[PDB]
Amino acid sequence: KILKPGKVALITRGRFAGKKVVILQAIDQGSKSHPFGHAVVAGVERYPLKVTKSMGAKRIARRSRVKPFIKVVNYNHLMPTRYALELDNLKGLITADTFKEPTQRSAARKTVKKTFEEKYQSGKSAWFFTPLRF
Amino acid sequence: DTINSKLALTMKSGKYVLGYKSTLKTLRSGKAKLILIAANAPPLRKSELEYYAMLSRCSVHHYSGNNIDLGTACGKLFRVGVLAVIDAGDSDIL
Amino acid sequence: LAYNTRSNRTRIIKTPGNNIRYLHIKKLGTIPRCGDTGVPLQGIPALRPREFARLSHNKKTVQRAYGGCLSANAVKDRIVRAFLIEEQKIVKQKLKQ
Amino acid sequence: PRQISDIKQFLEIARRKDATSARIKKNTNKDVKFKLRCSKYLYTLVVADAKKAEKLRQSLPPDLTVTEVG
RNA sequence: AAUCCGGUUAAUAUUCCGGAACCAGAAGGUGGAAUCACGGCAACGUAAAUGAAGUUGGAGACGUCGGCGGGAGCCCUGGGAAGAGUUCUCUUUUCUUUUUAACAAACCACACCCUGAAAUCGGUUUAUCCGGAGCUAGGGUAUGGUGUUUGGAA
């Protein structure tokens, strides 16, 4: 019961190892596609770089740009953390058809990236957006 | 001795899982009321179990004996470094 | 090359001229080993050190963090240990503060 | 020596300037072997029906110095 | 780092001749690819998929002995074929030979992952080894020692 929507966790398996993700939706009840403790998690593949006021606005935007990654991973693969991040734009956008339709997946990634950039601009969830050394 | 007797009674009355993955699954599900970890457990495994127990609000019991001693107390012939008890059953170990 | 040594490992083959000739077979390559565990990594073909250059970039490294230098089990353990140690430092700092 | 099973690419690699000489082999199995010499590799093609074999004789460019059985 | 086969001299051959490959380095050009690529829960996969300083990791690179498994060649042998025998008769018999290289293509099996939670102990070696630090079982992943089909090549 330690897994809830909007909770911050870390992925410990796969290509996106050691990347902080937020639980968009819990599928711990099990599913035919993933007969295990799977859940939809959205994380960051390229953490934003440090921003200097002397640098140009275009350069600052490029440094702050982050590439998100949305995938379903098992509960054992994930690692829950105390912190939790909740966003209005991240609620209700997760569905089976979203992962089923490739065009919907790209749209979801674009929406997640737009939401993350707004959060970075707002100066919130700095620990979550910051890359973790391992 | 009283804790060992309560654990032995719970092993036949309540629900218990004696294993790393089973306890981790039980801790994740939150059903594991108490988690018994042997003193000979690895520091990384003990810390991971403690973090999971803290997140799931479960009791953390540290057995003085090693995994062999924990298995002998549980009555099984297999070493069990970590065990998870969800229900105490007739016993009042919880 | 008199006084045959470990280098002169010859295998007899039948030529199309109905003749038996010895061909020198070089030592087989060794798959890269994981730095921490020491067990050989999975997904890397075992070729010679010089022949490893000809392979593509994706053919020598696994698509994961520390892939091709640390095993996946070691990678998972290293990631988990770092997170727990970071939490302990955070917990200790809060208590000390 | 790459065994080649696509007639069309055998045609285009013949027209490409790398091709130098071509040989045609008629074995006992009534199969026609087209061997094309390139800079580094000898490309061969095995066909089983004579009419396609003959059609690809006249489809080869005249500049190529084709030769019959050795 | 990288070569084989056949042929060739009065005397030299992995060197020469004929044919067929391989390695290293060098630039542009052409086509393809990304705007610092995706997929799979995972082990990982793919035609590509920038990485300075600085910091590491691996190969090279590592004792010896015994048994088991695999493959190759050699030896043994059944036919088939060829020739040379022996043979009043017997002897479907006696002797000899019966080739495919480097290299290049497609496919072909112990370590790990996923489901799983086990002792009524199971699996299993020629030799009892492992298992809640997760067995047997099911599905995968990688490593291909090799083998199959060719090309080379008649």
Side-chain angles (χ1 to χ4, degrees), chain A residues 5-6 9 14 17-18 26 30 35 37 39 42-43 48 56-57 61 68 80 84 92 96 102 107-108 123 126 131, chain B residues 8 14 19 30 32 38-39 41-43 53 65 71 73 75 81 84 88-89, chain C residues 2 16-17 29 32 35 38 40 43 45-46 49 53 65 67-68 72 74 82, chain D:
Chain D
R2 326 287 307 205
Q3 191 192 349
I4 293 318
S5 70
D6 287 20
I7 298 85
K8 304 192 88 161
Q9 73 154 240
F10 206 94
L11 153 72
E12 82 65 17
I13 197 187
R15 294 161 321 91
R16 172 192 325 145
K17 62 186 68 61
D18 66 333
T20 72
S21 69
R23 322 160 213 174
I24 296 81
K25 179 61 196 295
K26 305 264 312 170
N27 35 33
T28 85
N29 314 67
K30 202 52 185 65
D31 290 319
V32 153
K33 270 196 172 142
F34 283 95
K35 308 180 194 183
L36 178 55
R37 171 86 270 191
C38 279
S39 195
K40 162 161 51 158
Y41 272 21
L42 172 67
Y43 299 87
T44 189
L45 163 57
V46 180
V47 310
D49 78 90
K51 69 102 174 177
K52 190 61 71 184
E54 192 273 331
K55 283 204 315 295
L56 151 73
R57 314 301 330 300
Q58 57 70 25
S59 307
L60 291 203
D63 47 34
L64 172 43
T65 81
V66 317
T67 181
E68 296 293 328
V69 86

